[PDB]
Amino acid sequence: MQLVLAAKYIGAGISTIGLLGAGIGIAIVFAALINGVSRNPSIKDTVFPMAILGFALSEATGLFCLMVSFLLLFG
Amino acid sequence: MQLVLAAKYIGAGISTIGLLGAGIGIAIVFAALINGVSRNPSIKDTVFPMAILGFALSEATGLFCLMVSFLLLFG
Amino acid sequence: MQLVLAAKYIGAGISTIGLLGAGIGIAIVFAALINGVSRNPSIKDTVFPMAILGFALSEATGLFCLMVSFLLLFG
Amino acid sequence: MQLVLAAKYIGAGISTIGLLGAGIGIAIVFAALINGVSRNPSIKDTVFPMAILGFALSEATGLFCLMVSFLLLF
Amino acid sequence: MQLVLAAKYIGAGISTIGLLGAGIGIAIVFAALINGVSRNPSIKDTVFPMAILGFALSEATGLFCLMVSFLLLFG
Amino acid sequence: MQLVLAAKYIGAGISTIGLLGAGIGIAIVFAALINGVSRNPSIKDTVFPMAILGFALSEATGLFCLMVSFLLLFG
Amino acid sequence: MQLVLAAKYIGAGISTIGLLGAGIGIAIVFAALINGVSRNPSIKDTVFPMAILGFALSEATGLFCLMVSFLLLF
Amino acid sequence: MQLVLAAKYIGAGISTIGLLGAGIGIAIVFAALINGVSRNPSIKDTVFPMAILGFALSEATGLFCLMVSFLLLFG
Amino acid sequence: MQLVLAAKYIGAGISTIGLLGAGIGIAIVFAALINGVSRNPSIKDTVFPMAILGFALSEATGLFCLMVSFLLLFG
Amino acid sequence: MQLVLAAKYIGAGISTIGLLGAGIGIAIVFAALINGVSRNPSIKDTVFPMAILGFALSEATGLFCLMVSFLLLFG
Ligand SMILES: CC[C@H]1/C=C/C=C/C[C@@H](C)[C@H](O)[C@@](C)(O)C(=O)[C@@H](C)[C@H](O)[C@@H](C)C(=O)[C@@H](C)[C@H](O)[C@@H](C)/C=C/C(=O)O[C@@H]2[C@H](C)[C@H](CC1)O[C@]1(CC[C@H](C)[C@H](C[C@@H](C)O)O1)[C@H]2C
Ligand SMILES: CC[C@H]1/C=C/C=C/C[C@@H](C)[C@H](O)[C@@](C)(O)C(=O)[C@@H](C)[C@H](O)[C@@H](C)C(=O)[C@@H](C)[C@H](O)[C@@H](C)/C=C/C(=O)O[C@@H]2[C@H](C)[C@H](CC1)O[C@]1(CC[C@H](C)[C@H](C[C@@H](C)O)O1)[C@H]2C
Ligand SMILES: CC[C@H]1/C=C/C=C/C[C@@H](C)[C@H](O)[C@@](C)(O)C(=O)[C@@H](C)[C@H](O)[C@@H](C)C(=O)[C@@H](C)[C@H](O)[C@@H](C)/C=C/C(=O)O[C@@H]2[C@H](C)[C@H](CC1)O[C@]1(CC[C@H](C)[C@H](C[C@@H](C)O)O1)[C@H]2C
Ligand SMILES: CC[C@H]1/C=C/C=C/C[C@@H](C)[C@H](O)[C@@](C)(O)C(=O)[C@@H](C)[C@H](O)[C@@H](C)C(=O)[C@@H](C)[C@H](O)[C@@H](C)/C=C/C(=O)O[C@@H]2[C@H](C)[C@H](CC1)O[C@]1(CC[C@H](C)[C@H](C[C@@H](C)O)O1)[C@H]2C
Ligand SMILES: CC[C@H]1/C=C/C=C/C[C@@H](C)[C@H](O)[C@@](C)(O)C(=O)[C@@H](C)[C@H](O)[C@@H](C)C(=O)[C@@H](C)[C@H](O)[C@@H](C)/C=C/C(=O)O[C@@H]2[C@H](C)[C@H](CC1)O[C@]1(CC[C@H](C)[C@H](C[C@@H](C)O)O1)[C@H]2C
Ligand SMILES: CC[C@H]1/C=C/C=C/C[C@@H](C)[C@H](O)[C@@](C)(O)C(=O)[C@@H](C)[C@H](O)[C@@H](C)C(=O)[C@@H](C)[C@H](O)[C@@H](C)/C=C/C(=O)O[C@@H]2[C@H](C)[C@H](CC1)O[C@]1(CC[C@H](C)[C@H](C[C@@H](C)O)O1)[C@H]2C
């Protein structure tokens, strides 16, 4: 049971690597929001909800990674 | 038995790394949606369904990773 | 047998990493479809089949990764 | 117990890798802000809060990594 | 020979990582095809064979990865 | 306690990987500063403080990585 | 001897990772060819040999990886 | 002591990975300098100092990686 | 001396990872050659030698990786 | 002694990974040089020295990696 515990803790740390995807992705979505509004200010109210949706869906991939991390840590 | 359980848990952690691809990919699709709408607002109803399609197909790759993760954790 | 089984499960997890390629690639294809359509709406029926071909070929690289994962998991 | 402790320390190191996402992502948001403002200075006051929101959400992904790190360390 | 069989299985999993290159590359080619056709529809018949060639060559890098994987699994 | 000291040292090495994010990110910010100033020299005094802020925030992610590294080395 | 053999097989797998560079790089060259030809069709005959040279040199880096793989396997 | 020494040397090698960040980042800065100068030669004396600042800050992230490497090698 | 031999062979394989840098980099240089000539055909004789120099310098990083690989394999 | 030598050799292999950053970075600089000259041939003598500077500074990061590699291999 020492080796299995050890494996849970190493696995937990490994499971956070994938959060780099949401880190970069969320930024990509907001960068597009900024560039799109700068080029066409009147489009703000249209694309802002699209940026929020894009953020949420990219963020979810990070949520799945952290869930596994917490399952290994505590579950 | 200790060695096998340990391996399953390390394996489950490793299995989440691939989710970074969907994290970035989902964002790439939404960035294109936002930049496309900003450049040509009249195209919104045409490209929005393409963004949903793209997100879903990109998300599927992350779901396959999570499937293996859960099979290792629980199966 | 314990060490061999352990290696199968670690290998199965490692085998999912490559799916990040399709996660990003599927999105790159759909981003191009969206931007091409935004710039030239009249071309949509011509490029849509190209995007479907492109995403399918990109996805298949990840499915081969998953194939090896399942062979390791269940073989 | 020494094997478990060893693993916590290895795991704590591994858990910082994901911070590279925030490092890059924060910069992506600021690059868009700078280029957007350069192209259309009048839009600055509109896009700056969008930049604040974007970098904060990108940064938080890294804070989640660090939280697992600190859990393993302490 | 627990050790050698274990190594074949871990090696086979690792051998699939490289497939991410074809996943992204195939997409890059098709993205260019889509963007090139949208900007200049008359060029379609010229660039489409170029995109098939690009796909095949990128794909070949993933084929080699899978070849080593199967040699480790079955060879 | 060969094992625990060894783990602190391997962990400390691994903890520096994340610094690559600030390496790339800091550069991305300064690239935008340079391109923005070249395209619109009159905007320099506006965007320069933005680039300093961007650098600091990206840099902070590398600081956290180094903090964990030093905690593992000396803490 | 079993430990050495094990290592050769692990090493052979590791040696294919670098092929991802060629996978991406071959595609980068073809993307430029397609976009260059789309923008200026008259240039096709000039840039096509440049594309052949570029992808071949990119591809060779992957062949070097595979050579080490095969050395370890056989 | 053998295992601790072994871990120092493996750690020292791992500690160099992060230098890839500065390798790419230094180049991103200089690419921006070149393109900004090509588009607006008159701006060169203004942006050159920015590129030097940018590259130095990017490089330093890699130098911290190298610092940890040497501490592990020679400490 | 079994463990040291084993380490040489694993190290040799690890030392080829860095060749992915030249793979992507060489392509980047040739992509620029192609795009630059397409946009300005008269510049071909000027930029072609620059692409050859760029190729060689990027290629050298791959040479250093393969040298270490061959030193571990045979030296 | 076996364990320490083994570690040095694995370490030396790991130490070359960072060279990928210079491999990509050197190429990014030369691509900018080529695109800059193509857009504005008269700027060649100004930007060529900037490309040499950028390449050398990016290459230095790869040299630091190789330094650690050789110290492990031979020192
Ligand atoms: C996958 C679904 C995601 C939901 C998206 C919802 C989008 C709708 C949209 C309108 C949001 O509500 C939002 C833009 O207003 C929003 O994010 C706010 C709630 C949020 O307060 C935002 C405006 C901020 O100011 C924010 C930067 C906060 O200051 C910061 C402390 C929080 C960062 C953060 O990442 O929080 C997460 C995030 C919201 C995520 C987002 C989850 O949720 C939290 C709580 C639940 C779990 C723990 C997740 C885990 C994480 C790894 O995904 O973290 C939650 C802890
Ligand atoms: C190809 C499969 C994917 C399906 C895509 C379908 C696209 C159609 C499109 C119309 C969607 O339904 C959508 C845009 O309306 C949509 O995502 C809604 C369901 C959703 O309510 C949306 C509007 C949101 O508000 C959404 C951002 C939520 O706030 C947020 C909490 C959900 C994030 C998320 O990633 O959800 C996933 C996703 C839908 C994924 C979707 C998977 O499903 C969930 C629930 C089921 C299981 C648990 C999956 C596992 C995952 C790893 O694939 O996760 C599920 C957990
Ligand atoms: C390096 C050689 C590559 C060949 C390229 C040939 C290009 C010519 C071009 C005209 C093709 O024939 C094509 C575009 O028409 C084509 O690919 C068709 C065969 C294909 O049917 C296409 C129209 C599709 O619709 C396709 C998306 C299929 O629906 C889908 C089920 C197949 C995806 C796929 O990746 O298949 C691969 C691929 C063709 C690859 C292609 C390999 O082949 C398969 C079978 C052989 C091995 C197992 C490879 C492994 C892969 C990882 O390289 O996978 C083969 C299994
Ligand atoms: C998260 C907070 C960051 C602070 C940002 C502050 C921004 C304000 C801005 C006006 C700065 O002060 C600055 C641009 O003037 C500036 O950085 C100067 C201090 C600096 O002297 C600058 C002009 C330089 O010329 C600089 C390139 C130096 O010549 C060079 C030797 C230092 C590089 C470097 O990375 O230093 C770091 C950095 C400032 C970082 C910056 C950290 O600080 C140092 C010391 C503290 C720790 C050890 C960090 C670790 C690093 C990995 O984050 O490294 C510190 C060691
Ligand atoms: C770091 C210095 C690099 C030198 C660059 C020189 C540039 C000058 C320029 C005029 C060249 O000579 C060139 C463009 O004409 C050129 O590369 C030719 C020699 C080359 O034949 C080219 C035109 C091809 O047709 C080429 C695609 C061949 O068909 C292909 C079989 C060779 C691929 C290859 O990567 O070869 C390498 C390369 C030249 C590399 C290039 C080495 O050299 C070889 C032989 C020496 C060692 C073994 C290297 C190791 C490699 C990992 O760097 O591989 C050598 C084995
Ligand atoms: C900041 C340090 C870097 C120095 C940059 C200097 C730039 C100035 C600029 C004018 C150069 O000298 C140069 C462009 O003229 C140049 O590279 C020449 C020396 C070179 O002859 C050039 C014209 C070439 O033809 C060159 C492409 C050769 O064909 C090719 C065989 C060399 C590739 C190469 O990477 O060389 C390196 C590099 C110069 C590196 C340069 C390192 O040096 C070599 C020899 C010395 C040691 C062994 C280093 C180790 C490396 C890991 O840093 O490798 C050396 C092995």
Short mmCIF file of all heavy atoms in Angstrom, two decimals, chain A residues 1-15 69 71-74, chain B residues 2-14, chain C residues 10, chain D residues 1-14 68 72, chain F residues 3-4 7, unseen atoms left out:
data_model
loop_
_atom_site.label_atom_id
_atom_site.label_comp_id
_atom_site.label_asym_id
_atom_site.label_seq_id
_atom_site.Cartn_x
_atom_site.Cartn_y
_atom_site.Cartn_z
N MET A 1 0.82 -1.21 0.00
CA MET A 1 0.00 0.00 0.00
C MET A 1 0.84 1.24 0.00
O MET A 1 0.50 2.19 -0.74
CB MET A 1 -0.94 0.00 1.20
N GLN A 2 2.24 1.31 0.26
CA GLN A 2 3.20 2.45 0.10
C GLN A 2 3.36 2.82 -1.37
O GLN A 2 3.31 4.00 -1.71
CB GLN A 2 4.56 2.13 0.74
N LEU A 3 3.53 1.81 -2.22
CA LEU A 3 3.70 2.02 -3.65
C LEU A 3 2.46 2.60 -4.33
O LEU A 3 2.57 3.44 -5.23
CB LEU A 3 4.13 0.71 -4.34
CG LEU A 3 4.52 0.75 -5.82
CD1 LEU A 3 5.73 1.64 -6.07
CD2 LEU A 3 4.77 -0.66 -6.34
N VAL A 4 1.28 2.16 -3.90
CA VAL A 4 0.01 2.62 -4.47
C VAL A 4 -0.25 4.08 -4.09
O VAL A 4 -0.68 4.88 -4.92
CB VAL A 4 -1.17 1.71 -4.04
CG1 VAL A 4 -2.48 2.23 -4.61
CG2 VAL A 4 -0.93 0.27 -4.48
N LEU A 5 0.00 4.41 -2.82
CA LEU A 5 -0.05 5.80 -2.34
C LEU A 5 0.92 6.70 -3.09
O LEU A 5 0.56 7.79 -3.53
CB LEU A 5 0.27 5.86 -0.85
CG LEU A 5 -0.89 5.72 0.11
CD1 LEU A 5 -0.34 5.75 1.52
CD2 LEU A 5 -1.90 6.85 -0.10
N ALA A 6 2.16 6.23 -3.22
CA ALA A 6 3.16 6.94 -3.98
C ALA A 6 2.66 7.19 -5.42
O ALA A 6 2.77 8.30 -5.95
CB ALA A 6 4.47 6.15 -3.99
N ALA A 7 2.05 6.17 -6.02
CA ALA A 7 1.55 6.29 -7.38
C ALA A 7 0.41 7.30 -7.52
O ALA A 7 0.34 8.02 -8.51
CB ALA A 7 1.13 4.93 -7.92
N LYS A 8 -0.47 7.35 -6.51
CA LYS A 8 -1.57 8.33 -6.47
C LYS A 8 -1.05 9.76 -6.49
O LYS A 8 -1.63 10.63 -7.14
CB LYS A 8 -2.41 8.14 -5.21
CG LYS A 8 -3.52 7.09 -5.31
CD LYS A 8 -3.95 6.53 -3.95
CE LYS A 8 -4.20 7.60 -2.88
NZ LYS A 8 -5.44 8.42 -3.06
N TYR A 9 0.03 10.01 -5.76
CA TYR A 9 0.56 11.36 -5.63
C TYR A 9 1.32 11.82 -6.86
O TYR A 9 1.19 12.97 -7.27
CB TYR A 9 1.41 11.50 -4.36
CG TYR A 9 0.60 11.35 -3.09
CD1 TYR A 9 1.16 10.75 -1.95
CD2 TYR A 9 -0.71 11.80 -3.01
CE1 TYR A 9 0.42 10.61 -0.78
CE2 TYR A 9 -1.45 11.66 -1.84
CZ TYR A 9 -0.88 11.08 -0.73
OH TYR A 9 -1.62 10.94 0.42
N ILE A 10 2.11 10.91 -7.43
CA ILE A 10 2.76 11.19 -8.72
C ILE A 10 1.71 11.35 -9.83
O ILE A 10 1.78 12.30 -10.60
CB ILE A 10 3.83 10.14 -9.08
CG1 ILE A 10 5.04 10.31 -8.16
CG2 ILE A 10 4.26 10.28 -10.55
CD1 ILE A 10 5.96 9.10 -8.10
N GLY A 11 0.74 10.45 -9.90
CA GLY A 11 -0.36 10.58 -10.86
C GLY A 11 -1.13 11.89 -10.74
O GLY A 11 -1.53 12.49 -11.75
N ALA A 12 -1.34 12.34 -9.50
CA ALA A 12 -2.06 13.60 -9.26
C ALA A 12 -1.34 14.77 -9.90
O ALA A 12 -1.95 15.62 -10.55
CB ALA A 12 -2.25 13.84 -7.76
N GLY A 13 -0.01 14.80 -9.73
CA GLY A 13 0.82 15.85 -10.30
C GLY A 13 0.83 15.79 -11.82
O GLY A 13 0.70 16.82 -12.49
N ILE A 14 0.99 14.59 -12.36
CA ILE A 14 0.94 14.40 -13.82
C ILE A 14 -0.40 14.91 -14.41
O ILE A 14 -0.40 15.54 -15.48
CB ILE A 14 1.17 12.92 -14.23
CG1 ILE A 14 2.60 12.48 -13.88
CG2 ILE A 14 0.91 12.74 -15.73
CD1 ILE A 14 2.85 10.98 -14.00
N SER A 15 -1.50 14.69 -13.68
CA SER A 15 -2.84 15.06 -14.15
C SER A 15 -3.08 16.57 -14.26
O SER A 15 -4.09 17.00 -14.81
CB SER A 15 -3.93 14.40 -13.28
OG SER A 15 -5.22 14.64 -13.81
N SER A 69 -7.01 14.64 -11.07
CA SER A 69 -6.04 15.01 -10.05
C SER A 69 -6.63 14.87 -8.64
O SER A 69 -6.02 14.25 -7.76
CB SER A 69 -5.51 16.43 -10.29
OG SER A 69 -4.47 16.75 -9.37
N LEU A 71 -9.38 13.22 -7.78
CA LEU A 71 -9.75 11.81 -7.56
C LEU A 71 -8.55 10.98 -7.10
O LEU A 71 -8.68 10.12 -6.22
CB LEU A 71 -10.40 11.21 -8.82
CG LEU A 71 -11.89 11.55 -8.99
CD1 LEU A 71 -12.36 11.39 -10.43
CD2 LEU A 71 -12.74 10.70 -8.05
N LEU A 72 -7.38 11.24 -7.68
CA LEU A 72 -6.16 10.57 -7.26
C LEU A 72 -5.68 11.03 -5.89
O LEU A 72 -5.23 10.22 -5.07
CB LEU A 72 -5.05 10.73 -8.31
CG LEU A 72 -5.26 9.95 -9.61
CD1 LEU A 72 -4.36 10.48 -10.73
CD2 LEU A 72 -5.04 8.45 -9.41
N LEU A 73 -5.79 12.33 -5.64
CA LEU A 73 -5.39 12.89 -4.35
C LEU A 73 -6.26 12.42 -3.19
O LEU A 73 -5.74 12.06 -2.13
CB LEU A 73 -5.38 14.42 -4.39
CG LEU A 73 -4.15 15.12 -4.98
CD1 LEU A 73 -4.39 16.62 -5.06
CD2 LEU A 73 -2.90 14.81 -4.16
N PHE A 74 -7.58 12.44 -3.39
CA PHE A 74 -8.53 12.27 -2.29
C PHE A 74 -9.50 11.11 -2.46
O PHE A 74 -10.04 10.60 -1.47
CB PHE A 74 -9.34 13.56 -2.11
CG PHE A 74 -8.50 14.77 -1.82
CD1 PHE A 74 -8.34 15.76 -2.78
CD2 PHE A 74 -7.87 14.93 -0.59
CE1 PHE A 74 -7.57 16.89 -2.53
CE2 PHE A 74 -7.10 16.05 -0.33
CZ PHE A 74 -6.95 17.03 -1.30
N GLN B 2 -0.11 -4.69 -5.79
CA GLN B 2 0.41 -3.32 -5.51
C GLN B 2 0.96 -2.66 -6.78
O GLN B 2 0.64 -1.51 -7.08
CB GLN B 2 1.49 -3.37 -4.43
N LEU B 3 1.77 -3.41 -7.53
CA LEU B 3 2.42 -2.89 -8.72
C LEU B 3 1.41 -2.55 -9.83
O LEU B 3 1.54 -1.53 -10.51
CB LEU B 3 3.50 -3.87 -9.20
CG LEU B 3 4.51 -3.43 -10.28
CD1 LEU B 3 5.21 -2.12 -9.92
CD2 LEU B 3 5.53 -4.54 -10.49
N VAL B 4 0.40 -3.41 -9.98
CA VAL B 4 -0.66 -3.23 -10.98
C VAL B 4 -1.55 -2.02 -10.66
O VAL B 4 -1.80 -1.18 -11.54
CB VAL B 4 -1.49 -4.52 -11.16
CG1 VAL B 4 -2.67 -4.29 -12.10
CG2 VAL B 4 -0.61 -5.64 -11.69
N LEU B 5 -2.01 -1.92 -9.41
CA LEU B 5 -2.79 -0.76 -8.96
C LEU B 5 -2.03 0.56 -9.11
O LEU B 5 -2.60 1.57 -9.55
CB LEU B 5 -3.24 -0.92 -7.50
CG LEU B 5 -4.44 -1.82 -7.21
CD1 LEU B 5 -4.62 -1.98 -5.71
CD2 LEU B 5 -5.71 -1.27 -7.86
N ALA B 6 -0.75 0.54 -8.74
CA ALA B 6 0.13 1.72 -8.88
C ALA B 6 0.21 2.18 -10.33
O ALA B 6 0.10 3.37 -10.64
CB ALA B 6 1.52 1.40 -8.35
N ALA B 7 0.42 1.20 -11.21
CA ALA B 7 0.49 1.46 -12.64
C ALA B 7 -0.81 2.05 -13.20
O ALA B 7 -0.77 2.94 -14.05
CB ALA B 7 0.86 0.17 -13.37
N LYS B 8 -1.95 1.54 -12.74
CA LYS B 8 -3.26 2.04 -13.18
C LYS B 8 -3.41 3.51 -12.83
O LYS B 8 -3.93 4.30 -13.62
CB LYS B 8 -4.40 1.24 -12.53
CG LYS B 8 -4.68 -0.12 -13.16
CD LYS B 8 -5.38 -1.06 -12.19
CE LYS B 8 -6.87 -0.78 -12.05
NZ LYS B 8 -7.19 0.34 -11.12
N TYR B 9 -2.93 3.87 -11.64
CA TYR B 9 -3.09 5.24 -11.16
C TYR B 9 -2.15 6.23 -11.87
O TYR B 9 -2.58 7.31 -12.25
CB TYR B 9 -2.98 5.30 -9.63
CG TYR B 9 -4.10 4.55 -8.93
CD1 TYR B 9 -3.88 3.92 -7.70
CD2 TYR B 9 -5.39 4.50 -9.47
CE1 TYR B 9 -4.91 3.24 -7.05
CE2 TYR B 9 -6.42 3.81 -8.84
CZ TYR B 9 -6.17 3.19 -7.63
OH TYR B 9 -7.18 2.53 -6.99
N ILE B 10 -0.88 5.84 -12.06
CA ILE B 10 0.06 6.63 -12.87
C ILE B 10 -0.49 6.75 -14.29
O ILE B 10 -0.57 7.84 -14.85
CB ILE B 10 1.47 5.99 -12.91
CG1 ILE B 10 2.11 5.94 -11.52
CG2 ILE B 10 2.37 6.72 -13.91
CD1 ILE B 10 2.29 7.27 -10.85
N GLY B 11 -0.91 5.61 -14.86
CA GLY B 11 -1.55 5.58 -16.18
C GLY B 11 -2.73 6.53 -16.33
O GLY B 11 -2.87 7.20 -17.37
N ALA B 12 -3.59 6.58 -15.31
CA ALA B 12 -4.77 7.45 -15.34
C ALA B 12 -4.37 8.92 -15.41
O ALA B 12 -4.99 9.71 -16.12
CB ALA B 12 -5.66 7.19 -14.13
N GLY B 13 -3.33 9.27 -14.65
CA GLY B 13 -2.77 10.62 -14.67
C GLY B 13 -2.17 10.98 -16.02
O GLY B 13 -2.44 12.07 -16.56
N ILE B 14 -1.36 10.08 -16.57
CA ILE B 14 -0.75 10.28 -17.90
C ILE B 14 -1.83 10.49 -18.98
O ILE B 14 -1.66 11.32 -19.90
CB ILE B 14 0.20 9.10 -18.28
CG1 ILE B 14 1.43 9.06 -17.36
CG2 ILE B 14 0.65 9.20 -19.74
CD1 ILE B 14 2.26 7.78 -17.47
N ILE C 10 0.44 1.45 -17.88
CA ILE C 10 1.24 2.66 -18.11
C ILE C 10 1.32 2.97 -19.60
O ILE C 10 1.11 4.11 -20.02
CB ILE C 10 2.67 2.53 -17.52
CG1 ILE C 10 2.64 2.19 -16.02
CG2 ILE C 10 3.48 3.81 -17.77
CD1 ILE C 10 2.21 3.34 -15.13
N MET D 1 6.71 4.79 4.46
CA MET D 1 6.53 6.24 4.48
C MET D 1 7.52 6.98 3.63
O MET D 1 7.16 8.05 3.10
CB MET D 1 6.64 6.75 5.91
N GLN D 2 8.86 6.51 3.42
CA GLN D 2 9.86 7.32 2.67
C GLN D 2 9.50 7.38 1.19
O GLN D 2 9.75 8.39 0.53
CB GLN D 2 11.27 6.73 2.85
N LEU D 3 8.91 6.30 0.69
CA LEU D 3 8.47 6.19 -0.71
C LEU D 3 7.31 7.15 -1.02
O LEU D 3 7.27 7.78 -2.08
CB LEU D 3 8.07 4.74 -1.00
CG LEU D 3 7.53 4.30 -2.37
CD1 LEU D 3 8.46 4.70 -3.51
CD2 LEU D 3 7.31 2.79 -2.36
N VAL D 4 6.38 7.27 -0.07
CA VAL D 4 5.25 8.19 -0.19
C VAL D 4 5.73 9.65 -0.19
O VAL D 4 5.29 10.46 -1.01
CB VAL D 4 4.20 7.93 0.92
CG1 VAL D 4 3.07 8.94 0.86
CG2 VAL D 4 3.66 6.51 0.81
N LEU D 5 6.63 9.97 0.74
CA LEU D 5 7.22 11.31 0.81
C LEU D 5 7.98 11.67 -0.47
O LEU D 5 7.79 12.76 -1.03
CB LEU D 5 8.14 11.44 2.04
CG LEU D 5 8.54 12.86 2.45
CD1 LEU D 5 7.33 13.77 2.64
CD2 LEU D 5 9.38 12.83 3.72
N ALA D 6 8.81 10.74 -0.94
CA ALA D 6 9.52 10.91 -2.21
C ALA D 6 8.56 11.28 -3.35
O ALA D 6 8.80 12.22 -4.12
CB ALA D 6 10.30 9.65 -2.56
N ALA D 7 7.46 10.54 -3.42
CA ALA D 7 6.45 10.73 -4.46
C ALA D 7 5.77 12.10 -4.38
O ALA D 7 5.50 12.72 -5.41
CB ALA D 7 5.41 9.63 -4.37
N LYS D 8 5.51 12.56 -3.17
CA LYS D 8 4.92 13.88 -2.97
C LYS D 8 5.83 14.96 -3.56
O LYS D 8 5.36 15.87 -4.23
CB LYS D 8 4.65 14.14 -1.49
CG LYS D 8 3.41 13.42 -0.96
CD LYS D 8 3.45 13.19 0.55
CE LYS D 8 3.43 14.50 1.33
NZ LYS D 8 3.56 14.26 2.80
N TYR D 9 7.14 14.83 -3.33
CA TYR D 9 8.11 15.81 -3.84
C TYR D 9 8.26 15.78 -5.36
O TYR D 9 8.30 16.83 -5.99
CB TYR D 9 9.46 15.66 -3.13
CG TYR D 9 9.41 15.97 -1.66
CD1 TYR D 9 10.24 15.31 -0.74
CD2 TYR D 9 8.51 16.92 -1.16
CE1 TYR D 9 10.18 15.60 0.62
CE2 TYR D 9 8.45 17.21 0.19
CZ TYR D 9 9.28 16.56 1.08
OH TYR D 9 9.20 16.87 2.42
N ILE D 10 8.36 14.57 -5.93
CA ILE D 10 8.37 14.40 -7.39
C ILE D 10 7.07 14.97 -7.98
O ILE D 10 7.10 15.75 -8.94
CB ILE D 10 8.51 12.91 -7.79
CG1 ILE D 10 9.87 12.35 -7.38
CG2 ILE D 10 8.26 12.71 -9.29
CD1 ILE D 10 11.05 13.18 -7.86
N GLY D 11 5.95 14.58 -7.39
CA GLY D 11 4.63 15.06 -7.82
C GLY D 11 4.48 16.58 -7.75
O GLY D 11 3.84 17.18 -8.62
N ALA D 12 5.07 17.20 -6.72
CA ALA D 12 5.03 18.66 -6.54
C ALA D 12 5.76 19.38 -7.69
O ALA D 12 5.26 20.37 -8.25
CB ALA D 12 5.61 19.06 -5.18
N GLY D 13 6.94 18.87 -8.04
CA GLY D 13 7.68 19.34 -9.22
C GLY D 13 6.91 19.18 -10.52
O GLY D 13 6.80 20.13 -11.30
N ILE D 14 6.36 17.99 -10.76
CA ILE D 14 5.57 17.73 -11.97
C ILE D 14 4.39 18.72 -12.10
O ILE D 14 4.06 19.16 -13.22
CB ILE D 14 5.06 16.26 -12.05
CG1 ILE D 14 6.24 15.28 -12.18
CG2 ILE D 14 4.11 16.08 -13.24
CD1 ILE D 14 5.86 13.83 -11.91
N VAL D 68 -2.27 22.18 -6.42
CA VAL D 68 -1.96 20.76 -6.29
C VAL D 68 -0.51 20.60 -5.82
O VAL D 68 -0.22 19.75 -4.97
CB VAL D 68 -2.20 19.99 -7.61
CG1 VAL D 68 -1.68 18.56 -7.50
CG2 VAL D 68 -3.69 20.01 -7.98
N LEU D 72 0.67 18.79 -2.24
CA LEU D 72 1.64 17.71 -2.17
C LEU D 72 2.83 18.08 -1.29
O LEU D 72 3.34 17.23 -0.57
CB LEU D 72 2.10 17.31 -3.58
CG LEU D 72 1.02 16.68 -4.47
CD1 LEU D 72 1.49 16.64 -5.92
CD2 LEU D 72 0.67 15.28 -3.97
N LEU F 3 16.16 7.96 -0.70
CA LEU F 3 14.98 8.09 -1.55
C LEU F 3 14.36 9.50 -1.52
O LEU F 3 14.05 10.08 -2.56
CB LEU F 3 13.93 7.04 -1.15
CG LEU F 3 12.96 6.51 -2.20
CD1 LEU F 3 13.68 6.00 -3.45
CD2 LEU F 3 12.12 5.39 -1.59
N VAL F 4 14.17 10.04 -0.32
CA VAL F 4 13.55 11.35 -0.13
C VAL F 4 14.45 12.48 -0.65
O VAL F 4 13.98 13.36 -1.37
CB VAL F 4 13.15 11.59 1.35
CG1 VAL F 4 12.65 13.01 1.57
CG2 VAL F 4 12.09 10.59 1.78
N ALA F 7 14.47 12.39 -4.37
CA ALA F 7 13.21 12.91 -4.91
C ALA F 7 13.15 14.44 -4.89
O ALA F 7 12.56 15.05 -5.78
CB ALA F 7 12.03 12.32 -4.16
#
